[PDB]
Ligand binder design. Structure first.
Ligand SMILES: [Cl-]
Ligand SMILES: [O-]
Ligand SMILES: [Zn+2]
Ligand SMILES: [Zn+2]
Ligand SMILES: [Zn+2]
Length: 230
C-alpha cells in the first residue's frame, strides 16, 4: 500500500492519500550510489491545492505536477518548502514557471541563497522563534526550533490530524542518523518535544523519508539523535 522505491521508477512520482483531502507525494533520487525515497505533502484548500515541499529536483517536480494534474485535477496555487535543502527547494523554479506561488521563511530563503540553492519567492513571517506557529490556509506551520536544520518547519493539518515532520522526523526503519551536517544535534530533542507538546492529538505522522506512522516516530527520532550524539 504505501509506495516504496520498488513501485517508483527514478524520475517518477506516486501520490498516496493519508486522509480526506490530504496526500503525500513520493519520489526517489539516487544519492552517493544508493536510491532513497522522499516524501512531500499535498493538502486540498477549497478548490485548489497547497503543496508542501518539492519532489527533490526539477525533473521530479515537473512529474509531480503532471501526476497531480492527472489524478486530482485541482490546481496547485501555493507551495511551502520546509527547509533550505535541495530535496525541499529543488524544483522551486519549475513550480514558479508553472504559476505556483512558492513560500518559505526568511530563514530558509537566507540559507538557500547562501547554499546557492533555489529560493522560494514569498516569505513566511512569524516563524523565527522556536515555538512559533502561523496558519497557512488548511494547515498550521510550526517552527519547533533547530533540529535536522536550523530552519526546519513542520506542518499540521488540523482537519485530518496529520503531522508532516519533514526531515526533522525519521521513519522507524532508519536506525542511525542520516546526514546531520547542518543539524543542531544539541537542540534536536528539545525541538521534537515542542512538536510533541503542540500536537499531542496527531494521529498520522509523516517522516521526510519513508513510512508514515504515529507519534511514536518522535520518540524514535529522539532515540536515534541521542545515540548519534553519543
Ligand atoms: Cl536527506
Ligand atoms: O534534506
Ligand atoms: Zn535536509
Ligand atoms: Zn506571488
Ligand atoms: Zn531530507
Amino acid at each position: 500500500e504505501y509506495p516504496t522505491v520498488s513501485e517508483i521508477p527514478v524520475g517518477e512520482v506516486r501520490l498516496y492519500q493519508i486522509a480526506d483531502g490530504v496526500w503525500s507525494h513520493i519520489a526517489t533520487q539516487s544519492f552517493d550510489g544508493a536510491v532513497y525515497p522522499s516524501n512531500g505533502l499535498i493538502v486540498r484548500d477549497g478548490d485548489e491545492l497547497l503543496l508542501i515541499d518539492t519532489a527533490w529536483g526539477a525533473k521530479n517536480t515537473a512529474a509531480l505536477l503532471a501526476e497531480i494534474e492527472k489524478q486530482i485535477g485541482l490546481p496547485v496555487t501555493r507551495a511551502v518548502s520546509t527547509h533550505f535543502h535541495d530535496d525541499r527547494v529543488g524544483g522551486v523554479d519549475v513550480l514558479r514557471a508553472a504559476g505556483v506561488a512558492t513560500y518559505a521563511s526568511p530563514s530558509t530563503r537566507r540559507l538557500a541563497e547562501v547554499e546557492g540553492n533555489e529560493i522560494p519567492t514569498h516569505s513566511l513571517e512569524g516563524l523565527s522563534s522556536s515555538g512559533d506557529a502561523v496558519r497557512f490556509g488548511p494547515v498550521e506551520l510550526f517552527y519547533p526550533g533547530a533540529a535536522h536544520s536550523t530552519d526546519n518547519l513542520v506542518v499540521y493539518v488540523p482537519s485530518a490530524s496529520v503531522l508532516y515532520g519533514g526531515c526533522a522526523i525519521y521513519e522507524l526503519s532508519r536506525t542511525s542518523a542520516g546526514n546531520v551536517a547542518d543539524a543542531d544535534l544539541a537542540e534536536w530533542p528539545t525541538s521534537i518535544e515542542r512538536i510533541q507538546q503542540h500536537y499531542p492529538e496527531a494521529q498520522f505522522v509523516i517522516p521526510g523519508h519513508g513510512l508514515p506512522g504515529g507519534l511514536d516516530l518522535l520518540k524514535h527520532t529522539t532515540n536515534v539523535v541521542k545515540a548519534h550524539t553519543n
